Amino acid sequence: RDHRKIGKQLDLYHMQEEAPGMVFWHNDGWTIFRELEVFVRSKLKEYQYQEVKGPFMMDRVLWEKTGHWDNYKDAMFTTSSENREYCIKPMNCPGHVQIFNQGLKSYRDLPLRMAEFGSCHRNEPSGSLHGLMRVRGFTQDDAHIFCTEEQIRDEVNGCIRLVYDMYSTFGFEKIVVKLSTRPEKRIGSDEMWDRAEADLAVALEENNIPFEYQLGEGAFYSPKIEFTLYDCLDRAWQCGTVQLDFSLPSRLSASYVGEDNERKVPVMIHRAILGSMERFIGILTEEFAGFFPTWLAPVQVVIMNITDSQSEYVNELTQKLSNAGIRVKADLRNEKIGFKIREHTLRRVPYMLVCGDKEVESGKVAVRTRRGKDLGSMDVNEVIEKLQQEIRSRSLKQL
Amino acid sequence: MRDHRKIGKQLDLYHMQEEAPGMVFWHNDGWTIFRELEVFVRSKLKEYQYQEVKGPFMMDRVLWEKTGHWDNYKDAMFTTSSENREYCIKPMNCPGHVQIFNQGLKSYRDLPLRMAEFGSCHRNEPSGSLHGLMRVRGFTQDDAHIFCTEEQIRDEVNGCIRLVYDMYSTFGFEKIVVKLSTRPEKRIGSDEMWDRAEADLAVALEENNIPFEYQLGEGAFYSPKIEFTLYDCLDRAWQCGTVQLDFSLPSRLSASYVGEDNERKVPVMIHRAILGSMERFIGILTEEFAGFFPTWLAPVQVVIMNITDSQSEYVNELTQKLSNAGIRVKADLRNEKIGFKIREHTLRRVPYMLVCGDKEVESGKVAVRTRRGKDLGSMDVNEVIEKLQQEIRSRSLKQLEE
Ligand SMILES: [Zn+2]
Ligand SMILES: [Zn+2]
């Protein structure tokens, strides 16, 4: 259950000293990454989020006004062009404010939910790097909600609902929640921190969530709710975060026109559900021990022939399943069928289809799984419908 | 209005600012177009059997020195440092894909290996040369690299050629001009390899019955390239496609495989990009259609509007129905006159506008109007959905009844 070892055996990714802390996503690993993005986007549509994309580097002055430069200077990569210094972004917060600052906003535009799969870079110490868990370049399922003070409770409730909704899809039902309060170095008045901390605590209470206080562990600009999931080995993984931010939009000149026709500074809610998506893939790899659920499996079906007599039949089946939306590969190599089956079983391919002369004449296919279960000969259309149901429902296990 | 910068502002597609010169802030509507382009390209990757990978953003400068890229492009490269090591923000995807290739032992059975990526590239272009979406500092390329044997060159180059005309025809580009860019004066690689690479590219164009002209000295410093230029509706030339035959870089990056004769060989590498910079291609499409993006690319495909509050419930029901059908649909329930709403969404170039009166509510129908000012009359909602889905799935250039 080491994600580094499983990642190598399944050819998911690799890392090398020429790019410390940054991941080379191979075809099979990138397929898992993209399927996670599809799942998140399905939630972005359901929870009514916009999706945007920000530039990778911006002027260092942007990070000076937020206070991040004074506080996280050592952790940020910098580059220069024409006597101007730019920072490769470690977070998506200022970039989303820049998009919000384009075009005059009114209260009718709020709540404005802005999500992004933003890849961030942090100059972490090289000795602290570890596989997919602690990296230098990563992608977060980030989002920022611009809202009024009256809309804080509903929007924080939506973020909390989304956390439990997404975690349950992967089978994580044991979740421990902590609330981080003001640190010893911060921005924003005590009243603002008093209201922000109280709002987060009330939201947890109103959602029937018990929590502990992490005193002084909040960000320098906002308190945060931190969600920790527990894997099948009862190991704790802090993944989700919700921040109630009353300071950064003001420092970035964000404003909207209220119903009173008065200029107001919007409330910003930061949230990420999965956290670093590279890290989440590593957690899933160890949770499933490489046996990814069918909807996440890089290759869902492999169809093999026994002899060259079934080569045409396998190709027709592969196209049919491919057109049905199934990630399917044909294995027509000159090897024993038992050699082909073992190769794909070790790759944890959920379903393996074998076509002999009996299958060709009958129009059926023999089905076995990576767990060694023999499902016998099944109708081709029945196999497709079963696969589609397992994929579209994102079922954890085979039916 | 045909300038993509003006249309982009009117349609709220993107914005740029001096805090990040030559780098695009993609708004929701603009990012939707970008993602639809990604979905289209990925459909071709599936059809043409490409892998899709993702490389790191920065790599050791010593890796860019090995290919000669540092000596040629160092003034155009962004550099950053960490722990007394200097890193280059990648301006191209070639070395990263070779690094993926070099992982694990490769044999002839693994070739051809087609490796694609939507690679985010950055180049330190002069600020005076930047212009909208056409000339930027940060961009994404629909790049791919094919690792193959010498015997596989002709079929793999032919596949790249076919993909170029396949993808351009989807957007309505049928006037294509082809150039073969030969070796530049400042160059790496042997004379014999350059002769073979240039001859192979020329023969591949001959087999596809494609007339072309040579472009002396315009090839890359390591390989020649076929350059494809498309012509827009104003007969303006846009160089987008590129196919490179490369015998130099894989050797310099220690790429190798075990041949059928059980001896180590250096694979051939074919570089190709169809659209080129996808930000630039979006700008070209924006000007080509003058904001009238085809329905499959339109950020908002359908807008449903009421006349009074009596149809507010019916409009909301249909918006949910169309959204569940996979159609990007928005409801317009503001207290404005219906002509005011239609004019506003026509200026947003929304393909279809659905008007629901009380006669529409009882009949379960919708009054269909288009951004071209055409009245299509009342139609059944399910019939509307069926035709819209067919228009989107076929990526049709034309709307209903035109
Ligand atoms: Zn944030
Ligand atoms: Zn290349």
GROMACS .gro file of N, CA, C and O in nm, chain A residues 55 98 102, chain B residues 4-5 13-27 130-138 279:
model
  120
   55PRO      N    1  -0.363   3.320  -1.497
   55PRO     CA    2  -0.224   3.307  -1.541
   55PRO      C    3  -0.137   3.246  -1.432
   55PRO      O    4  -0.169   3.250  -1.312
   98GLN      N    5  -0.884   3.933  -0.939
   98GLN     CA    6  -0.864   4.010  -1.061
   98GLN      C    7  -0.979   3.989  -1.159
   98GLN      O    8  -1.026   4.084  -1.222
  102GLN      N    9  -1.302   4.278  -1.281
  102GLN     CA   10  -1.331   4.318  -1.418
  102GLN      C   11  -1.481   4.335  -1.435
  102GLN      O   12  -1.557   4.239  -1.417
  403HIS      N   13  -1.087   4.040  -3.217
  403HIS     CA   14  -1.115   3.944  -3.111
  403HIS      C   15  -1.107   4.008  -2.973
  403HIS      O   16  -1.175   3.963  -2.880
  404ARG      N   17  -1.024   4.111  -2.957
  404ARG     CA   18  -1.015   4.179  -2.828
  404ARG      C   19  -1.146   4.251  -2.794
  404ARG      O   20  -1.191   4.248  -2.679
  412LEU      N   21  -1.527   3.704  -2.236
  412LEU     CA   22  -1.450   3.582  -2.256
  412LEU      C   23  -1.321   3.581  -2.173
  412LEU      O   24  -1.290   3.480  -2.108
  413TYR      N   25  -1.247   3.691  -2.174
  413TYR     CA   26  -1.116   3.695  -2.109
  413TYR      C   27  -1.081   3.841  -2.081
  413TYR      O   28  -1.152   3.933  -2.121
  414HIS      N   29  -0.969   3.860  -2.012
  414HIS     CA   30  -0.913   3.993  -1.991
  414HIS      C   31  -0.764   3.979  -1.968
  414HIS      O   32  -0.714   3.871  -1.935
  415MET      N   33  -0.692   4.090  -1.987
  415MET     CA   34  -0.549   4.095  -1.962
  415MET      C   35  -0.516   4.225  -1.890
  415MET      O   36  -0.590   4.324  -1.899
  416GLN      N   37  -0.405   4.224  -1.816
  416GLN     CA   38  -0.364   4.342  -1.741
  416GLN      C   39  -0.212   4.346  -1.732
  416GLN      O   40  -0.144   4.245  -1.752
  417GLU      N   41  -0.160   4.465  -1.700
  417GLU     CA   42  -0.016   4.487  -1.697
  417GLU      C   43   0.053   4.413  -1.583
  417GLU      O   44   0.175   4.397  -1.586
  418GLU      N   45  -0.022   4.368  -1.482
  418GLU     CA   46   0.037   4.288  -1.375
  418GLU      C   47   0.083   4.151  -1.424
  418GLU      O   48   0.159   4.084  -1.353
  419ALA      N   49   0.040   4.109  -1.543
  419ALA     CA   50   0.087   3.984  -1.603
  419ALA      C   51   0.082   3.999  -1.754
  419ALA      O   52  -0.010   3.950  -1.821
  420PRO      N   53   0.179   4.069  -1.812
  420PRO     CA   54   0.176   4.095  -1.957
  420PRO      C   55   0.183   3.965  -2.037
  420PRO      O   56   0.257   3.873  -2.003
  421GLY      N   57   0.104   3.960  -2.144
  421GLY     CA   58   0.104   3.843  -2.230
  421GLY      C   59   0.047   3.718  -2.168
  421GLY      O   60   0.082   3.608  -2.211
  422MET      N   61  -0.038   3.731  -2.067
  422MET     CA   62  -0.096   3.615  -1.999
  422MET      C   63  -0.244   3.639  -1.977
  422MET      O   64  -0.284   3.748  -1.935
  423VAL      N   65  -0.325   3.537  -2.004
  423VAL     CA   66  -0.469   3.552  -2.020
  423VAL      C   67  -0.540   3.511  -1.892
  423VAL      O   68  -0.511   3.405  -1.835
  424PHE      N   69  -0.633   3.595  -1.848
  424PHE     CA   70  -0.730   3.557  -1.745
  424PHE      C   71  -0.855   3.507  -1.817
  424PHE      O   72  -0.932   3.587  -1.871
  425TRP      N   73  -0.877   3.376  -1.817
  425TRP     CA   74  -0.993   3.318  -1.883
  425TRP      C   75  -1.114   3.326  -1.791
  425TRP      O   76  -1.117   3.263  -1.685
  426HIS      N   77  -1.213   3.405  -1.831
  426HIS     CA   78  -1.340   3.408  -1.759
  426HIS      C   79  -1.419   3.280  -1.788
  426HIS      O   80  -1.378   3.195  -1.868
  529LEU      N   81   0.361   4.202  -2.792
  529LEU     CA   82   0.241   4.133  -2.746
  529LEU      C   83   0.116   4.197  -2.806
  529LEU      O   84   0.109   4.318  -2.826
  530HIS      N   85   0.017   4.113  -2.836
  530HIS     CA   86  -0.106   4.160  -2.899
  530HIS      C   87  -0.218   4.062  -2.870
  530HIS      O   88  -0.222   3.954  -2.928
  531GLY      N   89  -0.309   4.101  -2.780
  531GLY     CA   90  -0.431   4.025  -2.758
  531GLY      C   91  -0.403   3.879  -2.726
  531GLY      O   92  -0.317   3.846  -2.644
  532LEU      N   93  -0.478   3.791  -2.793
  532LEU     CA   94  -0.459   3.647  -2.781
  532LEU      C   95  -0.362   3.591  -2.885
  532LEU      O   96  -0.325   3.473  -2.876
  533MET      N   97  -0.319   3.672  -2.981
  533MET     CA   98  -0.238   3.622  -3.092
  533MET      C   99  -0.092   3.605  -3.051
  533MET      O  100  -0.032   3.501  -3.078
  534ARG      N  101  -0.035   3.705  -2.986
  534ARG     CA  102   0.104   3.701  -2.941
  534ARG      C  103   0.106   3.723  -2.790
  534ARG      O  104   0.084   3.835  -2.743
  535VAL      N  105   0.131   3.616  -2.716
  535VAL     CA  106   0.125   3.616  -2.570
  535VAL      C  107   0.255   3.558  -2.515
  535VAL      O  108   0.340   3.510  -2.589
  536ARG      N  109   0.268   3.564  -2.383
  536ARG     CA  110   0.381   3.503  -2.314
  536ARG      C  111   0.350   3.365  -2.260
  536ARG      O  112   0.438   3.278  -2.259
  537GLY      N  113   0.227   3.341  -2.214
  537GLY     CA  114   0.186   3.210  -2.169
  537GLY      C  115   0.075   3.153  -2.255
  537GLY      O  116  -0.027   3.218  -2.276
  678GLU      N  117  -0.485   2.955  -2.728
  678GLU     CA  118  -0.532   3.091  -2.707
  678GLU      C  119  -0.537   3.167  -2.839
  678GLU      O  120  -0.634   3.240  -2.866
   0.00000   0.00000   0.00000
